């Protein structure tokens, strides 16, 4: 039985590959061939926020499309007012090694985490006119990579011990644990209906999870290196990923396979972050060569370049109303484009 | 601007002063990275360290400078995903235990990756050889042939220790990096002086290469 089970595993893998082949009749490039291109897209820098003294690792927009938070290796969290470039809050962090941050949809909480292996929750709206720590979540055996809010009482985290978890803030415990990855989980993304989420790890694969039952639905493998970023389509039936092999790919859920590949011969550097537009016609990616490219999501053609940084672009972001794009970098600066 | 808009602008100015003060108070520190296999003497490298499973930070003060030491051994994951967080440190401290023939060929393997890393092209290394006394008493039983098979020489105390030092220094292939080596026992107390002198030579060399001499 120590070898009979292995034979059945290879048999089921071949059935899946043949089933996907039968569902492929035409490519997306063939279908969308008779569409006028979007053209040339040029964007200018409208704001430049200063005040950080080290590398910037993460940022997140608010649901009101005016407020945003950012994290840096100087041990500070800063909340900005993008319209007037005013600083609202500056929260000192106990551990200076930070890798991710999040902003609650309601607007009353923020999240932080890093090499300490604790996710920390901060209370913004309270008496005494100051920000105080509300909860410390412990239980991961590796560094925290990403975190996202579902409500004011639920949060999902990914870590470097090849697991994902869902927590209850008041109790301080984790209700569900998601397992199956082989390498370190690096990125995470939530669906608009918040009933499923997708993850990508260092085993060059992506998995679809069910929040309630805590099971695994589908697995996607098309890359050749580590996966760093992931994002959902606004419709909710597709997602995109970025890897270290200088390539972005688009995956479909109902067809359960890959649809498009975005690549060029002049790029040999990795991809740090990806994001979509409000309509879904544009895909934005940040690279290691200090730039940011704009792709046509339906025709796999370059449209524009955003070049204003002196070091590596670490993070991206698009407002809920699709009016601006924010970028962060290792030169302690973050800019707002339009 | 309205009455409340002017009040908000004044709040941002005070936050900008606190941020400026904290940056000044942080630039006058020396950051060092502590690496090595388990049971190599990392925890007791300096007698007067004070702690201030993730990352462990120990700080001590000497002369007038402030030293910060970071220990990362509790992260059993891929180093390449977080090794870039320590790109701007002054130097790297490496510890090797000479009484253990099992950790060998693993300490050498770990030393090779650090010395040939993309983010550490021009970072010097301060190398510590620990437990020389117990290594000397052990050599009367195992003549270093068990650990290193390709060894031919008079192995009393020195040619054995000289061989180990030559093995680590051969891993460096670069003209802008220097390796500092020192042998310590379990009772030596002048470890802070050795670190102080090595850092002083590092800053001098960095200043010459900024004026076109090296």
């Amino acid at each position, epitope marked *: 039985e120590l070898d009979q089970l292995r034979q059945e595993a290879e048999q089921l893998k071949n059935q899946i590959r043949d089933a996907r082949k039968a569902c492929a009749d035409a490519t997306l490039s063939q279908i969308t061939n008779n569409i006028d291109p979007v053209g040339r897209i040029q964007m200018r820098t409208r704001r430049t926020l200063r005040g950080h003294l080290a590398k910037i690792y993460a940022m997140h927009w608010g649901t009101d499309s005016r407020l945003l938070v950012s994290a840096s290796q100087d041990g500070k969290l800063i909340i900005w007012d993008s319209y007037t470039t005013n600083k609202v809050h500056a929260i000192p962090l106990r551990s200076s090694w930070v890798m991710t941050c999040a902003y609650a949809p309601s607007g009353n909480y923020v999240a932080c985490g890093g090499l300490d292996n604790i996710c920390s929750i901060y209370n913004l709206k309270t008496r005494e006119g*100051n920000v105080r720590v509300s909860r410390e979540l412990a239980g991961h055996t590796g560094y925290l990579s990403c975190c996202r809010f579902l409500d004011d009482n639920q949060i999902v985290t990914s870590s470097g011990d090849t697991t994902c978890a869902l927590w209850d803030i008041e109790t301080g415990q984790q209700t569900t644990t998601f397992t199956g990855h082989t390498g370190d989980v690096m990125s995470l993304s939530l669906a608009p209906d918040t009933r499923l989420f997708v993850s990508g790890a260092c085993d060059a694969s992506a998995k679809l999870w069910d929040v309630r039952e805590g099971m695994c639905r589908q697995t996607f493998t098309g890359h050749e290196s580590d996966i760093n970023a992931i994002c959902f389509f606004p419709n909710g039936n597709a997602f995109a990923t970025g890897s270290d092999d200088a390539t972005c790919r688009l995956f479909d859920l109902r067809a359960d396979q890959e649809l498009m590949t975005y690549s060029h011969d002049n790029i040999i550097c990795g991809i740090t972050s990806v994001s979509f537009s409000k309509s879904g016609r544009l895909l934005l990616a940040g690279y290691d060569d200090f730039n940011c490219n704009v792709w046509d999501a339906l025709k796999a053609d370059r449209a524009g370049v955003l070049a204003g940084h002196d070091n590596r672009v670490s993070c991206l972001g698009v407002t809920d109303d699709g009016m601006a794009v924010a970028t962060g970098s290792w030169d302690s600066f973050l800019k707002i484009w339009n | 601007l309205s009455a409340e808009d002017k009040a908000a602008v*004044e709040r941002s100015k005070m936050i900008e002063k606190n941020l400026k003060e904290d940056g000044i108070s942080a630039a006058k520190d020396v950051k060092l990275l502590l690496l090595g296999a388990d049971n190599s003497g990392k925890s007791t490298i300096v007698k007067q360290m004070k702690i201030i499973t993730g990352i462990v930070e120990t700080h001590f003060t000497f002369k007038n400078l402030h030293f910060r030491l970071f220990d990362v051994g509790g992260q059993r994951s891929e180093r390449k995903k977080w090794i870039h967080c320590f790109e701007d440190v002054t130097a790297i401290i490496f510890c090797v235990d000479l009484s253990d023939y099992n950790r060998m060929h693993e300490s050498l393997m770990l030393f090779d990756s650090i010395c040939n890393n993309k983010f550490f092209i021009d970072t010097s290394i301060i190398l510590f050889l620990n437990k020389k006394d117990l290594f000397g008493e052990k050599i009367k039983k195992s003549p270093l042939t068990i650990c290193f098979p390709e060894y031919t020489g008079p192995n009393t105390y020195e040619d054995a220790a000289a061989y180990i030092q030559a093995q680590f220094e051969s891993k460096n292939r670069s003209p802008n990096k220097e390796i500092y080596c020192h042998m310590t026992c379990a009772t030596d107390t002048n470890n802070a002086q050795v670190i102080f002198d090595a850092v002083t030579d590092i800053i001098i060399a960095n200043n010459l290469r900024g004026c076109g001499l090296y």
Partner: single-chain antibody
Amino acid sequence: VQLVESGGGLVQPGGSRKLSCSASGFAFSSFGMHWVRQAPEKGLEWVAYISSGSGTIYYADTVKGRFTISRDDPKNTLFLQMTSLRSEDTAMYYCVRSIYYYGSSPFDFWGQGTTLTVSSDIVMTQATSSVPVPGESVSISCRSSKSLLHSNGNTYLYWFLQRPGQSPQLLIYRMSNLASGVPDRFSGSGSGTAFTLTISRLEAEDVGVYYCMQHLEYPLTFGAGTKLEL
């Protein structure tokens, strides 16, 4: 949160006194502070204001050159020095805290005052002076001499309630927003120069005097006050 004021008493005309206030339960250094007085036969009147960091000081036109305001952060104390006291200065003096950033709620906490006895502005008009009125709906109105709608999209109108034998408390800020710890039956609406406050499903403990204030520019002005009686 607690604010306690000390001082007061009987002072001869032409004299001088000093008033103090003590804070406990919040961060005193991140708040601006105000002084507001209430004559025995009048309503509320603004006096002075000192900013966080002591960078800005404002005075009313009728206390300029006579009164002084200062703060002490290590000891958590606010001061007020008065000289050349006339008979019109007899009132009860309150101490109010306020914070200023995007989305905040200034004028949110008031203290219990101390009595003192001595032997181009915008005009806010509240036409109603008394209304006899349970289980019903009432509406109050306030008027302005100039439009309070700024070019940034904010209307700077504030409401307050003063129960008998108590200190005033905040109900509505910026003409629409509802303060914390206030039942949802209070609502606010209006436009430039015309404002209204609506109370639905009236209950007990809602009796008292209601005031409208503007925060567009200094000095800050109040209304006459409308009284609700059973």
